[PDB]
Amino acid sequence: PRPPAPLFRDPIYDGAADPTIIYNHLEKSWWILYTNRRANQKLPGKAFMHGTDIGIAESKDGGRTWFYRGTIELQYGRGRNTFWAPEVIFYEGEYHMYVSFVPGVPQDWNAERYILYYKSKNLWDWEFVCKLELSSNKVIDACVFQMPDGTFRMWYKDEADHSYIYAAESNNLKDWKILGPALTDRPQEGPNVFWWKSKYWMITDPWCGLGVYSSEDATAWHRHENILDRPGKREDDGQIGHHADVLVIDDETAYIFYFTHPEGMEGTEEFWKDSKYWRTSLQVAKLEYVDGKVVCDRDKEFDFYLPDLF
Ligand SMILES: [Ca+2]
Ligand SMILES: [Mg+2]
């Protein structure tokens, strides 16, 4: 059947955003990990975006039904801090998380941002490995893809360099070498790289729907039309899509997980003055390949199924 719409709302703060989907091999279930903004609280300034943990949504029926399981509450030093937009990959029997960190609970954008590396055997329990040394101390929104020579490539947003997408590389998943700016066409965030239809694709969030790029080498990018830039008809899908994660099932089947601010009015003073605008909803849509380009009709019915990985 068609996926649920919305796919999922967080039942603690209703601030589900920046979804990353990961198969839980031990419990044989699909997990979505998400930034949980404190969206249903009456808070000063931009506080609702901060003091965040990672929420867990689980499906045992291939994504037809989702249930909140709880939080991943990470620690980096002392106090109440901010955790954003985890990347999680399974590799050599372990889960590898690249999570964005903001010190304390800011009420504005006047703070550093780091990417931190945590590891887990079971997706519940995480051990701190290290802080990544990237191009600045204002870096967020890691995504990782393993290249054919075995080297892992990372993309992230550098807010200290015009909010451009940067690339880095690692052979051991711990130590990362800066490759430099990957995209210098526009400020954007939430990079997501995948392989499909014999090409590399990057999805970005330039805040007017999602950017779409293709590459033969995951270095030289060719820009295509945005997706999820027009309102959808489904419940809570009537606004631009944000910060996506792509799951490739097979050569014909790829799903895009994203979030909306369903009440809209982003980019206005009204957004910050009325907490009704703060809530976010997870969504899924099906990617298509038309005239050599990845496209998406968020309104088109499809039979959503997330099979167990064997
Ligand atoms: Ca991401
Ligand atoms: Mg992913």
Residue numbers in the entry: 2 to 311
Pull verbatim passages from the article behind this deposition.
Functional, biochemical, and preliminary structural properties are reported for three glycoside hydrolases of the recently described glycoside hydrolase (GH) family 159. Like some other glycoside hydrolases, Cs_Gaf159A, Ch_Gaf159A, and Ck_Gaf159A are activated by divalent metal ions.
Crystallization and structural analysis of the apo form of one of the Caldicellulosiruptor enzymes, Ch_Gaf159A, enabled the elucidation of the first 3D structure of a GH159 member. However, Ch_Gaf159A is substantially smaller than its homologues, consisting of only a five-bladed β-propeller domain. Each blade is composed of four mainly antiparallel beta-strands. The stable monomeric state of Ch_Gaf159A was confirmed by means of polymerization-induced self-assembly (PISA) calculations and size-exclusion chromatography. The positions of E190, D142, and D19 in Ch_Gaf159A exactly matched E186, proposed to be the nucleophilic catalytic base, D127, and D14 in XynB. E190 in Ch_Gaf159A is suggested as being catalytically important given its proximity to the glycosidic O and its description as a catalytic base in XynB. The surface representation showed two electro negative pockets, one of them capable of incorporating the X2 ligand. This substrate pocket structurally explains why Ch_Gaf159A acts as an exo-arabinofuranosidase, or -galactofuranosidase.
